Structure 1
Amino acid sequence: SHHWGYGKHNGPEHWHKDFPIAKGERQSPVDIDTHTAKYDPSLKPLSVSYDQATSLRILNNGHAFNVEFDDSQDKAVLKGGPLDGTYRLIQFHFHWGSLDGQGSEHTVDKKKYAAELHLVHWNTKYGDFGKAVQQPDGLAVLGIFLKVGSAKPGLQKVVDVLDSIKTKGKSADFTNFDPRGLLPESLDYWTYPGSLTTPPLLECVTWIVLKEPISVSSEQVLKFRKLNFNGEGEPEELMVDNWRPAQPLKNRQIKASFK
């Protein structure tokens, strides 16, 4: 069974033994060298269409928490930019640190942010998520950096439910949440071909990483850090530092949407 995690004994340096693609040619995350990334005029406009997003539930899966959506129809979709066709929102989750100076997966000129939000979408030409992850263009992940400063009002409904999903396997109703409240003002982004950042590490993702971070409060991120990796009644292991480090860029170029 799967026993990977984020500790010294089962963390990112161990993953390759059960998931050999860990050492592949298009792994994520990566460092974004801002000086080397080039404006690409071939990028069509990005279209984030979350008006009809239908959230359902929040789950602690023992690695992060997922806010899950109804993806049985095209209720919330991502299109445009580097993408061909229509990608359906399935869930979002975060990666974060034990302290504010680490937590993001992607880095920007080697700078680590306090956390990173991943809005996960699957290409509807493949019919279901499980089929999509087996294709090089199956998923689109919209990544958004979090810095600590002023509170993010649209994040607070998430923060407030976390005490009800402390431990692995716990879930709670999470209807009527609007994920548009987690975006920054600007949709300027970087994009490159990569992978899932957890096992199974499949090389199925078009990454779209927004340049502008969102600001969250220290109090908000401190609440993330009270979650547990463990299940109920087990010795407490705080859910912190659930991020994979940057991986080799290899034969890839990061493109910018902006001049």
Structure 2
Amino acid sequence: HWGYGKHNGPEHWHKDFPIAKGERQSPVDIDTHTAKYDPSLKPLSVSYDQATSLRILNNGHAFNVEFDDSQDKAVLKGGPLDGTYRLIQFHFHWGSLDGQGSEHTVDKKKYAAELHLVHWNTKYGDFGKAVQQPDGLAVLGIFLKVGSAKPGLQKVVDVLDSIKTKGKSADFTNFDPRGLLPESLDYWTYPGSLTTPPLLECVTWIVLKEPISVSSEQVLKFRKLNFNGEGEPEELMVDNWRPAQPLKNRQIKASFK
């Protein structure tokens, strides 16, 4: 029953998920002047050459592109991380307008959308166990701005008509998530949470500095999705973003000078 509407949106979530007002909640505003360069941070290692995409699902909140995470096929290592994080799914958050949609902000700047590549720590064996651990997840966050098309996104945009409503899924094999990356892997990193209920404080956030460009037509097709199930009143899936949460006792570190 949590959602992004007038009556079940982020300001309501604390009533069922009290951790909503916790000490390490996500997203946050990235104040670029206060983030400290950490020369001890390693380059990120994104190893997606063997990625196996399986399926795309409208879950009533976003759409997830799901991967085979039963082996080390698509992993994130290095940067702030200790050990190996396996890609399980990616999804986006986006706006009703180009002026909003991202969850993270940069000097209070909102982007049109934000991609989340979600990875779990293989020392915890499965995703359900990982989300119970302070270092269980690594989420790679990538900002989207509207401009030139992202060629590697179009296979996602073209299948959305087949999963318009909540609970619909479609086969989505041989998708290469490398086509969603910017040129540079420069990043900010801080400890945080899932940005949807249950808002567990289990995430190392790695947010890329360089946004990707998508076309107006690409993001317009995201905004044709539905939050509702088939045969229910149409509610456009837009503005599925949580706003910036208090930083509290946390330091955002930069991989770059």
* TM-score (normalizing by structure 2): 1.00
The answer to whether residue 145 in structure 2 is matched with residue 137 in structure 1 is: no
Q: CA deviation at 1:219?
A: 0.1
Instruction: For 1:72 and 1:39, locate their aligned partners in 2 and report how far apart those are by CA, in whole Å.
Output: 35
Instruction: For 1:128 and 1:90, locate their aligned partners in 2 and report how far apart those are by CA, in whole Å.
Output: 10
Output the aligned Cα RMSD: 0.3
Instruction: For 1:176 and 1:40, locate their aligned partners in 2 and report how far apart those are by CA, in whole Å.
Output: 37
Instruction: For 1:168 and 1:72, locate their aligned partners in 2 and report how far apart those are by CA, in whole Å.
Output: 26
Q: Which digits, 9 at most, give the CA deviation of each residue in 1:184-229, with x for residues without a partner?
A: 0000000000000000000000000000000000000000000000
Instruction: For 2:97 and 2:43, locate their aligned partners in 1 and report how far apart those are by CA, in whole Å.
Output: 36
Q: CA deviation at 1:83?
A: 0.1
For residue 179 of structure 2, give the secondary structure of its aligned residue in structure 1. helix
Instruction: For 1:230 and 1:224, locate their aligned partners in 2 and report how far apart those are by CA, in whole Å.
Output: 14
Q: CA deviation at 1:42?
A: 1.2
Instruction: For 2:40 and 2:192, locate their aligned partners in 1 and report how far apart those are by CA, in whole Å.
Output: 19
| Counterpart residue number, 1:215 | 213
Query: Which ranges of structure 2 fall in alignment gaps of 5 or more residues?
Result: none
Instruction: For 2:3 and 2:44, locate their aligned partners in 1 and report how far apart those are by CA, in whole Å.
Output: 34
Deviation above 6 Å: which 4+ runs of structure 1? none
| Counterpart residue number, 1:38 | 36
Instruction: For 2:43 and 2:199, locate their aligned partners in 1 and report how far apart those are by CA, in whole Å.
Output: 28
For residue 13 of structure 1, give the secondary structure of its aligned residue in structure 2. helix
Query: Which ranges of structure 1 fall in alignment gaps of 5 or more residues?
Result: none
Q: CA deviation at 1:178?
A: 0.2
Q: CA deviation at 1:119?
A: 0.0
Q: Which digits, 9 at most, give the CA deviation of each residue in 1:48-98, with x for residues without a partner?
A: 000000000000000000000000000000000000000000000000000
Q: CA deviation at 1:160?
A: 0.1
Q: CA deviation at 1:44?
A: 1.6
Q: CA deviation at 1:41?
A: 1.1
Q: Which digits, 9 at most, give the CA deviation of each residue in 1:5-29, with x for residues without a partner?
A: 0001000000000000000000000
| Counterpart residue number, 1:100 | 98
Q: Which digits, 9 at most, give the CA deviation of each residue in 1:221-244, with x for residues without a partner?
A: 000000000000000000000000
Q: CA deviation at 1:130?
A: 0.2
Deviates more, 1:240-249 or 1:35-44: 35-44
Q: Which digits, 9 at most, give the CA deviation of each residue in 1:158-205, with x for residues without a partner?
A: 000000000000000000000000000000000000000000000000
Aligned residue pairs, count: 257
Instruction: For 1:33 and 1:199, locate their aligned partners in 2 and report how far apart those are by CA, in whole Å.
Output: 25
The answer to whether residue 186 in structure 2 is matched with residue 178 in structure 1 is: no
Q: Which digits, 9 at most, give the CA deviation of each residue in 1:136-158, with x for residues without a partner?
A: 00000000000000000000000
Deviates more, 1:211-220 or 1:41-50: 41-50
Deviates more, 1:37-46 or 1:98-107: 37-46
Instruction: For 1:25 and 1:95, locate their aligned partners in 2 and report how far apart those are by CA, in whole Å.
Output: 23
For residue 14 of structure 1, give the secondary structure of its aligned residue in structure 2. helix
For residue 10 of structure 2, give the secondary structure of its aligned residue in structure 1. coil
Instruction: For 2:126 and 2:181, locate their aligned partners in 1 and report how far apart those are by CA, in whole Å.
Output: 26
Deviates more, 1:42-51 or 1:89-98: 42-51
Q: CA deviation at 1:251?
A: 0.1
* TM-score (normalizing by structure 1): 0.99
Q: CA deviation at 1:247?
A: 0.1
Instruction: For 1:46 and 1:230, locate their aligned partners in 2 and report how far apart those are by CA, in whole Å.
Output: 38
